[PDB]
Swiss-Prot record, chains A, B:
Gene: rep
Lineage of the species this protein comes from: Viruses, Riboviria, Orthornavirae, Pisuviricota, Pisoniviricetes
Effect of N142A: Does not affect ability to cleave and inactivate human TRMT1
Organism per entry: Severe acute respiratory syndrome coronavirus 2
Listed result of changing Q189A: Does not affect ability to cleave and inactivate human TRMT1
Signal sequence range: none
Coiled-coil segments: none
Complete-protein stretch covered: 3264 to 3569 of 7096
Protein name (record): 3C-like proteinase nsp5
Means of activity regulation: Inhibited by pyridone-containing alpha-ketoamides compounds 13a and 13b. In turn, alpha-ketoamide 13b (tert-butyl (1-((S)-1-(((S)-4-(benzylamino)-3,4-dioxo-1-((S)-2-oxopyrrolidin-3-yl)butan-2-yl)amino)-3-cyclopropyl-1-oxopropan-2-yl)-2-oxo-1,2-dihydropyridin-3-yl)carbamate) inhibits SARS-CoV-2 replication in human lung cells. Inhibited ex vivo by michael acceptor inhibitor N3. Inhibited ex vivo by compound 11a and 11b.
Amino acid sequence: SGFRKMAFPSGKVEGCMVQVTCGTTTLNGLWLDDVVYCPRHVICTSEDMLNPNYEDLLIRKSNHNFLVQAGNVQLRVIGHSMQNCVLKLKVDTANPKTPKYKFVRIQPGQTFSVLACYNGSPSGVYQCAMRPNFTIKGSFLNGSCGSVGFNIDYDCVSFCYMHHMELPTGVHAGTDLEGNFYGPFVDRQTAQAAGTDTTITVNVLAWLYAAVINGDRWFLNRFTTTLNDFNLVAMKYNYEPLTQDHVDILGPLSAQTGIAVLDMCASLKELLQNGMNGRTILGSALLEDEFTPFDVVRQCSGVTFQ
Amino acid sequence: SGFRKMAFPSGKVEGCMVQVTCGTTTLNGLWLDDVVYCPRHVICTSEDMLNPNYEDLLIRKSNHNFLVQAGNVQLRVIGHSMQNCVLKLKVDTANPKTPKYKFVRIQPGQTFSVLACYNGSPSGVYQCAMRPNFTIKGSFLNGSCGSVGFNIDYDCVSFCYMHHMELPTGVHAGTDLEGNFYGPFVDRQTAQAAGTDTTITVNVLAWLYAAVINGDRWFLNRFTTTLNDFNLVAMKYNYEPLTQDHVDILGPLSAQTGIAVLDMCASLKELLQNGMNGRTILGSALLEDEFTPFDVVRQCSGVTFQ
Ligand SMILES: [Zn+2]
Ligand SMILES: [Zn+2]
């Protein structure tokens, strides 16, 4: 038993990371088949980032100005193209380590693993969520741009995020692997403020089921509620409204535990109105919202990847 | 910027995991060179675990009773030996993916990554610490035995933990790769209670430096203290005593921030006596003690692994 914030094993992604340099800018790229994907701001100077015209900047670059290195070994760039906010560098060699993969675009509330890298070299792996305001709260120092987020289903890597930006408040923004930003953010060094970072209610509920399965039970109470009554309290605490869809997704955890979803909602309502009174749940003094229902089921059941 | 609980990239370890079955018991083994290491309780039935005599049990096993599978492929066992609480199964093939490696024995307070596996297949990676009572707080379901903990220095994997036991309170016990348990625990299904799980003070202090570097600063105050005065409060709150050695280890973070170690100790003393008053530090409502000083330096500087 036990319950930890867990990332996917990162080896399949480690085998795809490369270094991309253009002029004086170095960042990371993702090498899949014969394409390397990277942020288009690789072509920018620090000065360019204040008001970049990327089509104009890109005209001054040739294939030979994109230096791509995979370990100690150089890759030959035979084409380049811009797709939204990513560049696709065609190389003359297919990555021999390319895993089965998909590109997907995730919704707020979904979780994914990030492989933080520098100079094409993996440093660490962690687990995070797309926030309701379309930011992520990561760990990204200068040079981490182009690091990716992903989920794994058995042997298939679903890439969902590429890192591009830190906002002036220290939260992070980036794109899917089609180069479309999550949320309203742009790849320019400008005033970009994030909206309310609400709490992902369905994920908190999943985690409270995890707690009960893993023997933390002190917060269970004698009450129930309704979606509409719960949602009046969610609104007042900057929680996402709970929908019947969310109730349906929590069905399997409800069936396992025998705790009706709306009963768990009443426990959550109490926790919001009363606080934890100096107690902890699964080692946290805050209600944790970076586990999805699927994450809880997976970790409580023992699912593996080949 | 940002600061996350981060595991090491797990690919080098993924390439070493295998499945080991003996009779009806399946668990994980670690394949390095031509040796597979696994918990010796692979030879036990659930019944045997109540009072096992492992030398006697092991006499009834031959090389051909240890089934070792690496992916879809069987390995041939050409010898076996018991070393403390691990078995070493000699195989006729060296693992072609063997990384540079060391076996080390860590001290309480040190952190490491765990690659949780089932049936020889990696499921997830997380980050944890050897507690002062020699337990770890992991996520281990039936079948996870033999999963390992490790640290990476560039390209060298230091293996420090192999999972063996869950205590009746749901915390975890295991061995180094020489098969010696951490702490007083044994591989028998018996009354084994853990001692006080104190807080790793030097690690909390490191994390408060991380907070200041990453712009969380509200807890900085006008006070200082002394080691002896601080330690009177540590004792009263079930914190580990702080030593001059610990002060020395925090020197680089003190130099970066310009906050003297004993000043940070006075901030920590306030936090202990006053609580957080509903505030957070780096996303936590608890003082986090699973980052070492070295972890903080690494993550705040951008260190990579090849
Ligand atoms: Zn960048
Ligand atoms: Zn076991």
